[PDB]
């Protein structure tokens, strides 16, 4: 089998991308945020405080006939950004772009942060690691994708977001038509439960590159670049005017400015983020001062290629036994 989704950003910064989600019987229609950086599937539902809900689509598990409560089944989770959310636990139908599981653990929320509710446009997330991450107690559940893979032609998924327009998440094939040159394969490790791996490099705009082992994360969940200090430093001092704002959290920029690209290494192979990519437009509505999405790392304790990165090139997620990474440009 296979299955291809649409991925829309939710807005004109690209800050994430949602992708239809059809759960339960008859189908319930979620936007989730597919996440490469974690491996639980929650949703906003009929369970969810209703004073912690502002506009997302709920999922109503006593309106689907394949709803089943997994007993005693809990879930909470945190992410890197400081949100959370937690819940209980059903099984139930659920596809993506025409590829059907059964028994997928749907993690219905009881409660979520607030940066969840202030979001309007995201009704959940679909986690693509490693099942090692889930957060189900006291019986861990599959991923999505870790359900389906048997069943898919090749055990793959794919991202390919867009720059201000949308993208697609293909699951058992790969689209030959969807990028260009040939795809860079590179080797995951998984003993944190990501999609963890190690890029050759870098340069910024036109300058030499610069060979040096950076190991970070494939997080499509993840709206930037999260790199060493060194590297940043290196990125925004071709930018003038740009400065590390403790106030604003990171580095800004002027809005006036023209970005310089760049470049990340996959083995021997090259992936040009375009300067544009890496505006993130004002600090404040009004504001002359602009948000970098090249970003430290330092305070995070992983580098992360989030949709920044990812957004320059055509990503498999290979799921074989021994699972890689493939990077193509297009």
Same mark, same amino acid.
């Given at each position: 089998?296979?299955? +291809?989704? /649409?991925?829309?950003?939710?807005?004109?910064?690209?800050?994430?991308?949602?992708?239809?989600?059809?759960?339960?019987?008859?189908? $319930?229609?979620?936007?989730?945020?597919?996440?490469? @950086?974690? +491996?639980?599937?929650? !949703?906003?539902?009929?369970?969810?405080?209703?004073?912690? &809900? #502002?506009?997302?689509?709920?999922?109503?598990?006593?309106?689907?006939?394949?709803?089943?409560?997994? %007993? *005693?089944?809990?879930?909470?989770?945190?992410?890197?950004? *400081?949100?959370?959310?937690?819940? #209980?636990?059903?099984?139930?139908? !659920?596809?993506?772009?025409?590829?059907?599981?059964? @028994? $997928?653990?749907?993690?219905?929320?009881?409660?979520?942060?607030?940066?969840?509710?202030?979001?309007?446009?995201?009704?959940?997330?679909? @986690?693509?690691?490693?099942?090692?991450?889930?957060? !189900?107690?006291?019986?861990?559940?599959?991923?999505?994708?870790?359900?389906?893979?048997?069943?898919?032609?090749?055990?793959?998924?794919?991202?390919?977001?867009?720059?201000?327009?949308? =993208?697609?998440?293909?699951?058992?094939?790969?689209?030959?038509?969807?990028?260009?040159?040939?795809?860079?394969? /590179?080797?995951?490790?998984?003993?944190? =439960?990501?999609?963890?791996?190690?890029?050759?490099?870098?340069? &910024? =705009?036109?300058?030499?590159?610069? %060979?040096?082992?950076?190991?970070?994360?494939?997080?499509?969940?993840?709206?930037?670049?999260?790199?060493?200090?060194?590297?940043? +430093?290196?990125?925004?001092?071709?930018?003038? *005017?740009?400065?590390?704002? +403790?106030?604003?959290?990171?580095? &800004?920029?002027?809005?006036?400015?023209?970005?310089?690209?760049?470049?990340?290494?996959?083995?021997?192979?090259?992936?040009?983020?375009?300067?544009?990519?890496?505006?993130?437009?004002?600090?404040?509505?009004?504001?002359?001062?602009?948000?970098?999405?090249?970003?430290?790392?330092?305070?995070?304790?992983?580098?992360?290629?989030?949709? &920044?990165?990812?957004?320059?090139?055509?990503?498999?997620?290979? *799921?074989?036994?021994?699972?890689?990474?493939?990077?193509?440009?297009?």
């Amino acid at each position: 089998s296979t299955g +291809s989704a /649409t991925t829309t950003p939710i807005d004109s910064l690209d800050d994430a991308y949602i992708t239809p989600v059809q759960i339960g019987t008859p189908a $319930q229609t979620l936007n989730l945020d597919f996440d490469t @950086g974690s +491996s639980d599937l929650w !949703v906003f539902s009929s369970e969810t405080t209703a004073s912690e &809900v #502002d506009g997302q689509t709920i999922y109503t598990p006593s309106k689907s006939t394949t709803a089943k409560l997994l %007993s *005693g089944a809990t879930w909470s989770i945190s992410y890197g950004d *400081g949100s959370s959310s937690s819940g #209980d636990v059903y099984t139930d139908t !659920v596809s993506v772009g025409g590829l059907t599981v059964t @028994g $997928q653990a749907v993690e219905s929320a009881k409660k979520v942060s607030s940066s969840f509710t202030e979001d309007s446009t995201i009704d959940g997330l679909l @986690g693509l690691a490693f099942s090692t991450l889930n957060t !189900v107690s006291p019986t861990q559940q599959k991923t999505f994708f870790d359900n389906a893979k048997a069943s898919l032609d090749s055990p793959v998924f794919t991202a390919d977001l867009g720059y201000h327009a949308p =993208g697609t998440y293909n699951f058992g094939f790969i689209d030959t038509t969807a990028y260009t040159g040939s795809i860079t394969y /590179t080797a995951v490790s998984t003993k944190q =439960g990501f999609w963890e791996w190690t890029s050759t490099g870098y340069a &910024v =705009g036109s300058g030499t590159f610069k %060979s040096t082992s950076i190991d970070g994360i494939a997080d499509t969940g993840t709206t930037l670049l999260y790199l060493p200090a060194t590297v940043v +430093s290196a990125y925004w001092a071709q930018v003038s *005017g740009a400065k590390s704002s +403790s106030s604003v959290g990171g580095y &800004v920029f002027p809005c006036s400015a023209t970005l310089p690209s760049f470049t990340f290494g996959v083995g021997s192979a090259r992936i040009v983020i375009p300067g544009d990519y890496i505006d993130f437009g004002p600090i404040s509505t009004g504001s002359s001062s602009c948000f970098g999405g090249i970003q430290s790392s330092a305070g995070i304790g992983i580098n992360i290629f989030g949709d &920044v990165a990812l957004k320059a090139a055509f990503v498999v997620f290979n *799921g074989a036994t021994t699972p890689t990474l493939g990077f193509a440009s297009k």
